[PDB]
Design a protein around this ligand. Sequence first.
Ligand code: HEM
Ligand code: HEM
Ligand code: HEM
Ligand code: HEM
Lengths: 140, 140, 146, 146
Amino acid sequence: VLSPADKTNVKAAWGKVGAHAGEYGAEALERMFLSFPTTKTYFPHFDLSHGSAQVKGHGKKVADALTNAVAHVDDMPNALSALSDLHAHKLRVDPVNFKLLSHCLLVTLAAHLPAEFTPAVHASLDKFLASVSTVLTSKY
Amino acid sequence: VLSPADKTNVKAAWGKVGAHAGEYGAEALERMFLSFPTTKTYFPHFDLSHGSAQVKGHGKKVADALTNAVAHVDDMPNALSALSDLHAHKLRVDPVNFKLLSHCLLVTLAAHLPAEFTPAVHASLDKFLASVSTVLTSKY
Amino acid sequence: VHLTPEEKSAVTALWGKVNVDEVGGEALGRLLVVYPWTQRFFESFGDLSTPDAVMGNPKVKAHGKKVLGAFSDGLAHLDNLKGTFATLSELHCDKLHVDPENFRLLGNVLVCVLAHHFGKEFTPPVQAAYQKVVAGVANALAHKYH
Amino acid sequence: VHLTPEEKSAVTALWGKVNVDEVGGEALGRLLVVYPWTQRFFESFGDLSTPDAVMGNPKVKAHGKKVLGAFSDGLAHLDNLKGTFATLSELHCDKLHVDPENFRLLGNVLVCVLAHHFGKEFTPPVQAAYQKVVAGVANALAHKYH
Ligand code: HEM
Ligand code: HEM
Ligand code: HEM
Ligand code: HEM
């Protein structure tokens, strides 16, 4: 579970994203595709050119989905139930790749939140994205 | 989460351990110490050689916890709360090590219950030990 | 990876009695059953809907047979594992993009299968020898990621 | 571990600007905070009970400085990381018995710190170059397990 401090830190730091959520998703996806090229094969037909609209559009949906998960932080298994079946049953995403995206979302937040990315918040965001990752890999 | 099918499978398979709990528990630790020598450092106060009475004794406690967990399958967080506290806070067991012991418990069961250790039961047992391991690292 | 003379002697003695026709497919079958994301890579193999289908699948059995063939090569050339797997590493890494984590999973599934078939013979000292091999094969197959 | 001529320059340019006396401590600190089980190896170091204690700890910062020295010595020997780190491999593997997975986690935490201190300047092209370095340092530190 996530300590009431962890949730406060997740709701604090992710609230500051707000409007740029769509743009941070895109950067975290770009970061993962460049750092870990094995992940590209899940997006074979994507335009992965720097600042492609298709990646901006997908970064938008991932960001929106994480926003939803902050709002249902006590109720994630049911919030992201359709998203679980998608990643697990249809897409067959290797659990390892969730640690890769989660890490690239951490790099993106640290690079955008100088004052806001303290060790404490780092630990809370890490635990948060680990929880989302556990739910999304849950229907195996 | 564990399914009705998976619970049925674990209860049936773990049921056949019976009076051999300590024997199986102790063999699994020995397999883990020989195969993954980095685990030996968590038991510095033990003779870890073959035939050790500290290992046989610890094997029994480990296997008993598992019987207990099988019986509280639908309620594992509360059943293992005390054990999670010992493993996470007091001992600070690297989560990697739970995978290593879990693999050696499957190997042990595989070698001792041939007819029981079908693919479906292998899959159930692996899921169950992952669930046990998640709870035992929950206080991280 | 460095096996002791006794370890190497024990490994070979066990491998001699492996049924080259079934064990490979048992390992590959259990991988697809226990770690279902691995099915992403064998959609060409047909019905993998249920455990009994996966283990019944003639293509999983025939592919398994090739998978064991490559472990046998590895056992025969423990001092040249990187080389033995050079072609298969660029296959699995550069072309298939399998995460090297799954290499280690298949290895541990192989160990379960050997334990399940040999019972009392698959002693902890023998297991320790085999955990060094499959770790070596996994590391070798993953060279193109290094 | 192959960095292209532009990857080596992007990596060098950034590293040049790293505060050699603080970044190490920041990396080791966040490892202990984010991955508490890691404190098990640093009980000699005194108070690690809260973030503030961890970052404030003079022994953490003193040790962080020695870790960043070993990363600096790796960035000047990218073509032979096995030999640069075979002394430290023995130490962590045979002496300290650290599980090699933790070398990966420290690597990624250091990538997070470089991201925190440089902001927009730590682009993916630059991150991607560093992921190859940290993966390379981890793999070389772990070699006395292979
Ligand atoms: C925190 C982690 C993740 C979140 C929140 C997330 C969220 C989403 C969302 C919202 C969608 C849109 C699905 C729809 O329209 O119904 C999606 C689709 C998808 N996700 Fe993820 N995802 C995550 C991790 C991953 C990872 C690690 C991979 C692969 C490495 C992945 C691969 C995909 C793919 C392939 C699609 C379908 C895209 C298409 O239409 O071709 N996801 N994800
Ligand atoms: C399914 C996994 C595991 C179970 C069910 C389990 C269960 C237990 C139990 C029942 C005890 C004794 C509790 C008591 O006497 O108060 C214990 C103690 C301990 N466990 Fe575990 N354990 C597991 C995994 C691990 C792993 C992976 C490690 C290390 C690699 C580990 C290291 C220890 C240590 C060091 C002790 C202390 C024993 C002593 O004081 O001598 N455990 N565990
Ligand atoms: C030590 C571990 C493994 C060994 C020794 C191994 C060995 C082999 C061999 C010998 C082939 C056939 C080569 C050929 O016909 O040219 C092959 C093909 C293949 N392997 Fe593996 N493999 C391993 C692990 C994995 C894993 C974990 C996956 C996926 C999760 C995987 C996916 C495949 C696929 C998709 C093919 C091609 C099958 C086809 O399209 O017909 N392998 N492997
Ligand atoms: C990239 C990863 C790492 C690098 C480059 C690294 C480097 C070093 C260096 C340079 C030293 C000093 C050796 C000496 O002065 O003789 C050291 C010591 C040590 N390292 Fe690491 N290390 C790494 C990862 C880890 C991790 C993950 C752990 C534990 C989780 C760890 C635990 C230790 C310990 C306990 C010492 C000895 C501390 C003491 O003297 O009390 N290291 N390491």
